[PDB]
Amino acid sequence: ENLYFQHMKHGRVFIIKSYSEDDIHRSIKYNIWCSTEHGNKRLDAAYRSMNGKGPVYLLFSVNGSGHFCGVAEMKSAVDYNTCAGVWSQDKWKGRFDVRWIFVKDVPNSQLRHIRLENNENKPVTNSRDTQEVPLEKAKQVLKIIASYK
Numbered sequence: 001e002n003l004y005f006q007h008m009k010h011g012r013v014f015i016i017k018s019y020s021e022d023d024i025h026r027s028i029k030y031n032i033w034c035s036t037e038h039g040n041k042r043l044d045a046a047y048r049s050m051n052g053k054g055p056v057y058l059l060f061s062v063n064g065s066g067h068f069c070g071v072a073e074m075k076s077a078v079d080y081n082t083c084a085g086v087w088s089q090d091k092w093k094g095r096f097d098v099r100w101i102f103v104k105d106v107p108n109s110q111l112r113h114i115r116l117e118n119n120e121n122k123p124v125t126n127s128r129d130t131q132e133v134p135l136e137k138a139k140q141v142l143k144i145i146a147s148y149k
């Protein structure tokens with residue numbers, strides 16, 4: 001058995017959706033990310049209120065890909081004023097640090113039975129960018145990702 005996540009009360013987990021595989025590769029390479037304005041604000045608020053007493057995890061998936069592609073931890077607050085045009089499209093304003101934990105493809109079939117009570121009970125696999133995941137469901141997703149071979 002694996003009881004590691006048991007007793008973790010302090011943790012917040014978000015879905016990250018990307019239209020670009022290039023941005024995923026760049027994120028892995030340089031340990032940085034950027035979301036939408038409203039996505040950034042959501043993530044920044046979670047990171048800042050965590051106050052270092054627990055992790056903010058990010059579950060990454062490319063739109064239309066059929067799989068999640070990995071997990072990173074948010075590792076800084078959002079800097080809203082940074083170099084433009086670093087990503088595939090020039091829509092993004094700002095940057096924050098991340099540390100990647102899993103770089104592995106996990107099919108949606110492996111995760112589609114976990115549903116989110118805060119998103120109308122929809123499969124976690126039908127989430128939008130910066131959808132937050134309740135902690136108990138997040139623990140379930142993490143364990144499946146970690147154990148997928």
Ligand SMILES: CNc1ncnc2c1ncn2[C@@H]1O[C@H](CO)[C@@H](O)[C@H]1O
Pocket residue numbers: 017018019020023033034035036063087092128129
């Ligand atoms: C660098 N960051 C990013 N790169 C590519 N696509 C992103 C992104 N952040 C969000 N998205 C996607 O683009 C949409 C916003 O235009 C979001 O709902 C996501 O699906």
